[PDB]
Amino acid sequence: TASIAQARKLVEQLKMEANIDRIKVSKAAADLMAYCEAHAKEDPLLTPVPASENPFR
Amino acid sequence: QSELDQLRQEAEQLKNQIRDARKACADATLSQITNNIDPVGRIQMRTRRTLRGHLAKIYAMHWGTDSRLLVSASQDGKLIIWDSYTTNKVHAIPLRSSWVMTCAYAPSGNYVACGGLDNICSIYNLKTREGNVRVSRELAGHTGYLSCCRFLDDNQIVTSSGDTTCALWDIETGQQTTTFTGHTGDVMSLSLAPDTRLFVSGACDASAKLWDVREGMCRQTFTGHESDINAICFFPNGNAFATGSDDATCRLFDLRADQELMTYSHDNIICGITSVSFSKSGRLLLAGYDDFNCNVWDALKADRAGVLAGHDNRVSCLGVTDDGMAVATGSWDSFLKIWN
Amino acid sequence: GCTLSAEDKAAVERSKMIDRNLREDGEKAAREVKLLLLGAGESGKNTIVKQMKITTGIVETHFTFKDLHFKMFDVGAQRSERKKWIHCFEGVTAIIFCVALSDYDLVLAEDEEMNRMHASMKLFDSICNNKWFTDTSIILFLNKKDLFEEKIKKSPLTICYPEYAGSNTYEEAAAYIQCQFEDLNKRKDTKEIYTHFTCSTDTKNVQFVFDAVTDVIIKNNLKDCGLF
Amino acid sequence: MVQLVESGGGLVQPGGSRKLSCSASGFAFSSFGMHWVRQAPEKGLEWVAYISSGSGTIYYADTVKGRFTISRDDPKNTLFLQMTSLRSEDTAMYYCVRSIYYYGSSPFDFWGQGTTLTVSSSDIVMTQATSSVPVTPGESVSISCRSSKSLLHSNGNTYLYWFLQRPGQSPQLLIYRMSNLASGVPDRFSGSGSGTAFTLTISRLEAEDVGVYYCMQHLEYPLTFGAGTKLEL
Amino acid sequence: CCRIEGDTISQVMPPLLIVAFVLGALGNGVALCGFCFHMKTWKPSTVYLFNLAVADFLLMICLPFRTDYYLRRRHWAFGDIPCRVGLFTLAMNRAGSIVFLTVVAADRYFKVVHPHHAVNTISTRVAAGIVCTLWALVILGTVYLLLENHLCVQETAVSCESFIMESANGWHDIMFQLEFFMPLGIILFCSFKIVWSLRRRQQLARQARMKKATRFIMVVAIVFITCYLPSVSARLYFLWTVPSSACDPSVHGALHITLSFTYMNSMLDPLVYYFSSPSFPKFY
Ligand SMILES: O=C(O)c1cc(O)cc(O)c1
């Protein structure tokens, strides 16, 4: 009866996690790619900016 | 002990059902979709600043929200707040316990937190009526070493400890509000979501968990590594996160798909990862390594795009400003560098 | 700073003062002697730290001897995994390991099969051969000598070491225990072990620690001079 | 808890010498720079001297240079000003002002209750054209200050300070660096400007906002105050 | 003047000086390259080695000025003032290489016999003040090298020399004897005490590293003995029987041999100090 509480809680957690909804991998990948090219102009690390507006020049 | 055996069997069958659902939901891969787009060019990043003054190994750092100030923690018993533009030192806070290995900077800029082997999270008031920095609170509810801490606002902070638990604190009252349990292993890192409604953690059981702050419950569990997880970071979108382990690999997980997406590894690399971070657009993934180097990965194609090599010891911490202009690396050689 | 405004120059001056204070504190802290104290609960760490100086995770004890300041750290309260924080103590001057002679036959409460002496030997082997302590001296203390005298007459040492073939007298048994502990070191040439038997010694363990620390300091000085 | 008390003064024969002292309590005295600021009767403020934290840097006004000296006593938390060859126009009230300098600090944020000294018988010019404005409660008012030289530095910030002196009291900081509010100032004061012309706006004027308003530049030494602008009912 | 008229010196010196110049410059250059470019932290006991290497380098710089002088039969072909700074870095850089032999040998005595002494923990900004008050007293010692004349002219050739003959008083003789003998006593005392103290460490001695470190203490002392004894002894013998020795050609043959032996101290110092040390950096 000592180890039955932890096991019952684990079974409850597994039951709760088994009821989550899942989307297809293609949709998640496409959303990530859409975000990646949809913000490319605002990221200075891969697109260097001229030394006029670079505070670390 | 038949009840224990049947509970074990039920847990195993539930795990098998979850795995089967994940497999059935898995169609194609990220690489197959991403192969259409053109690859990113070679990344040539150069050291712009070098911050000196720490006299021992540096364990943690955190950028301010203004992308100018930052705080660094060293085991010489000192917290230093730097002005990254002029290299000037703003504050130097002496620590009661020198065994600090985490630090955080409040989003309002008014407070700094640190902790370590003393099992205590200390809060420091930067804006005082006097001219000095004072301790405003000490949180002493943990039974293991503090590994990470992150502010939510001026009154809430989330900490992770070696007692395999995470806790949410009320700073003004100094009491724990919620306790997050379930890891069964040393929790090493934390990462807050941009909306602050959720956070993820990584522990020595080679698993990652997603928690709901309001409800104090574990929603999802991710298991793809075969060794201890040392660092974790949310994707800027808020629907993904990356993990760095001691098996010399990094992985990308998706919350909605509830499984792994891509792995970043190389045969020439055999050392463990100490820190990870994302760029503002999320295209670049920066990871620190034990081989004294920091690698820049292409988050969409799993192709290395550059190397930051300016340290002669282990790279312990990473950081990218909120505006994405600069990247900072700390190291065991007692130097911080700003790369751009 | 010819291109700096008055406020910028004042900020630079403040940063210079902060740098000076940091340098002075760092020089002040470089003259301290730091010791990492390890062992088990019943080994006798409390007795040793009491003799030295006449839920928290780490305890710091400060004492002085012959104008030299010592800092001792006890990490016995940390029940988490050792490999995740042991690297923080890399660079310590020396390690102090406490062992009780009288616990050669007693068994641990947690595990019946496991013996206390073999558990201590396993811990010593793990710490001595650690990759963060490949050049760190070890000071080994044997803590319960009179109880060893009492228990050796009423019980042989062969119960702990089945292969012990020698007289059950105190001297041979103590030598066998010491050599068994010292055989765990593998570097041999790189690092050395200091051993000292303690029952109720008064202001003699501190002298032993002082001598070992002096040897370590001389080695560091010779490394600094390049004559090494 | 912050407090600054000065001692010294009284009637002085011309050509004599005295030493003014100020005592600090309630804050880390050694971490703050110290200024002496002078105000003659029915006249505006005038900077005198400055000693840095750690005594590394010392400046003086050209009027008092050679005759006045400034020093600190950090263990005793005291500030000194030894004056020699006192003349007629040194008769004024002397204030002691604390200031701390780092990224984002607020200099000149606390003024002491100065003492009165009576003696018997290029630089940037900051100008305020208006000298008096009649006001009534509930009305919005604007105060203007103009600078001979542009106060906009190449680092991106403008060094303009606004102070208020209520009748019978010590000056109080309102706006620092032309846009930032002080710690305990209501959100009815606003500041703005461009290079050489600056304005201070007081929305929903109340009976508490009656006094003299001074503008200051902190771009370079010596520090110069503008003329006063009095608000009356 | 007096006319030795001996070509054996003119045929023996160029070998020794050429060998010294060609084997002594690259080692000191490598040591200088490694001291600054290949190091990160400047703690004491490193500044003194740097200054000794600099003194050796300065000797090597001015050494070739006399490898052709002896080839043309002791003729100073070019210059009259240039033989005032050509014998100035032969008493500035020859006496600034014996002082830093007494400094490196007195710094090792305070790290083996007095490990907790305060001198062991001084900052780099304090030793920089000692190497800047010894290296200046070295100059102050040899002002007359620039405030006197040395050229002596003969029928066919001019000879510029300072260790010439007779009974040179109070300078280039007395300073010579003191700067040899006095540092020697300190070096011998320090070397004996260091070994005596280091042998009493019964458990440190079992390591071969200690044995190598103790052998290198005596190596430096014997090298210093065998490289400067002839130079002092020859001048002493000349000074004693100077009545009879009216600049005898045999005598002048020997003193030029012994100074070439002194010139090999800066040859041997790099190889003894920097190259035979595991802890110093590598040059591939
Ligand atoms: O090194 C010298 O000072 C020196 C001086 C001489 O007169 C001759 C010589 O061969 C060397």
Numbering used by the authors:
A (entry chain C): 6 to 62
B (entry chain B): 1 to 340
C (entry chain A): 2 to 55, 181 to 354
D (entry chain E): 1 to 121, 136 to 247
E (entry chain R): 6 to 289
The authors write:
To date, despite extensive investigation into the architectures of HCA2, including its inactive form, agonist engagement, and biased allosteric activation, the structural elucidation of HCA1 remains unaccomplished. The negatively charged carboxyl group of 3,5-DHBA delves into the pocket, establishing a robust salt bridge with R993.36 and forming a hydrogen bond with Y2687.43. Additionally, the backbone of S16745.52 engages with the hydroxyl moiety of the agonist, a conserved interaction across the HCA family. The additional interaction of the 5′-hydroxyl group in 3,5-DHBA with R712.60, Y752.64, and H2617.36 in HCA1 highlights its pronounced selectivity for HCA1. A complex network of polar interactions involving E16645.51, H2617.36, Y742.63, Y752.64, and R712.60 is formed in HCA1, whereas hydrophobic residues occupy the analogous positions of 45.51 in HCA2 and 7.36 in HCA2/3, delineating a more constricted cleft between TM2, TM7, and ECL2 in HCA1. In particular, the toggle switch motif in HCA1 is Tyr2336.48 instead of Phe in HCA2/3 and Trp in the majority of class A GPCRs.
Hydroxy-carboxylic acids possess both hydroxyl and carboxyl functional groups, playing a pivotal role as intermediates in energy metabolism across various biological processes, such as lipolysis, tumor proliferation, and inflammation. Additionally, HCAs’ ligands, characterized by a hydroxyl group, engage with the conserved R3.36, Y7.43, and the backbone of S45.52 across all HCAs.
